[PDB]
């Protein structure tokens, strides 16, 4: 079994092919607290131990570990998150080989050549031993690494002359990863990583607002509100203090404007790209402003209906 694991700070995305050749996808939010959870009734809890420390998957706890940083790539929580994603995917527990991911600036030196040091640090992290309480964990056999952003442009780069270049803008929870890549993947003009520019800018602001509105929860719940920002009834069902909905929506709106302006300023630093692609969960939030800011003709702008999965799908199309 070979499983493609785009292991992002916010969500693990999995893609893999079944025995009968059908392709499956699974997403798994990285919300874990440093304590075992308690099972009541029909609730199956996932309690893990790694290096003498206990964790549980907990989607609602305000004490869920905040994972919005570079260190997380090689962290213990990462290993828990990836095992948990495997254990909730529907695949039978087993040995597996995996292809995981690194941020551009971790995967590449300033010359756009692999940073074998960091690439190996990544592979070694998945050697850490982990226990699931009252159950068996998958065993992680062979580990290979790919860069983030770039693999998502695979299909599009195929029908692109080697003179055209595609700007792939990957906005995740922690990091803005930008790459400019020549047609047929014949070259890489430029990479760029900003690990202080993520949707967490918004997540963090929404989380604080929710707490003020007496809806104290995890980063995940805050993202859940960002995802449903356009649904006033959803907002009204989730947010406890009915009198403070505008505090959440406006806090969200201001951080979104900040997100936008910061992202657009970053684009000003690229030039000569003929095509523009926007991928990641953040794509939904910035795609209009990007298309507009780049004056790229409609046909040269690329945005899928499942932006969060663009990367892991590309990893699959390439490496499976």
């Amino acid at each position: 079994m070979l499983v493609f694991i785009d292991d992002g700070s916010t969500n693990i995305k999995l893609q893999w092919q079944e025995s009968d050749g059908t392709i499956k996808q699974h997403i798994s939010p990285n919300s874990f607290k440093r304590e075992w959870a308690v099972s009541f009734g029909d609730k199956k809890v996932f309690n893990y131990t790694l290096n003498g420390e206990q964790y549980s998957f907990d989607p609602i706890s305000p004490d869920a570990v905040v994972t919005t940083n570079i260190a997380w790539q090689y962290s213990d929580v990462n290993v828990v998150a990836v095992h948990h994603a495997l254990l909730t995917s529907g695949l039978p527990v087993s040995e597996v080989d995996i292809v995981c991911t690194l941020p551009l600036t971790e995967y590449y030196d300033r010359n756009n050549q692999p940073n074998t040091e960091n690439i190996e640090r990544k592979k070694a992290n998945f050697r850490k031993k982990i226990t699931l309480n009252g159950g068996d964990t998958f065993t992680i056999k062979d580990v290979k690494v790919m860069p983030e952003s770039i693999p998502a442009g695979y299909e599009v780069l195929q029908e692109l002359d080697e003179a055209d270049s595609l700007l792939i803008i990957d906005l995740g929870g922690t990091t803005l990863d930008i790459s400019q890549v020549m047609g047929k993947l014949s070259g890489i003009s430029k990479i760029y990583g900003d690990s202080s520019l993520g949707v967490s800018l918004v997540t963090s602001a929404v989380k604080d607002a929710l707490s003020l509105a007496r809806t104290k929860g995890s980063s995940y719940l805050a993202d859940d509100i960002i995802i449903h920002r356009k649904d006033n009834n959803y907002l009204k069902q989730r947010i406890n203090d009915e009198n403070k909905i505008s505090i959440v929506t406006e806090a969200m709106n201001e951080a979104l404007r900040k997100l936008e302006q910061r992202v657009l300023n970053t684009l000003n630093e690229f030039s000569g790209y003929t095509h523009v692609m926007v991928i990641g969960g953040g794509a939904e939030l910035i795609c209009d402003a990007v298309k507009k800011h780049t004056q790229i003709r409609d046909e040269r702008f690329f945005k899928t209906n499942n932006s969060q999965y663009d990367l892991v799908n590309g990893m699959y199309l390439i490496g499976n």
Partner: peptide, 13 residues
């Protein structure tokens, strides 16, 4: 296809 997929393999390390 073949040229792109070829180059794609440098993305796997």
């Amino acid at each position: 296809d073949e040229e792109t997929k070829k180059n794609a393999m440098k993305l796997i390390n």
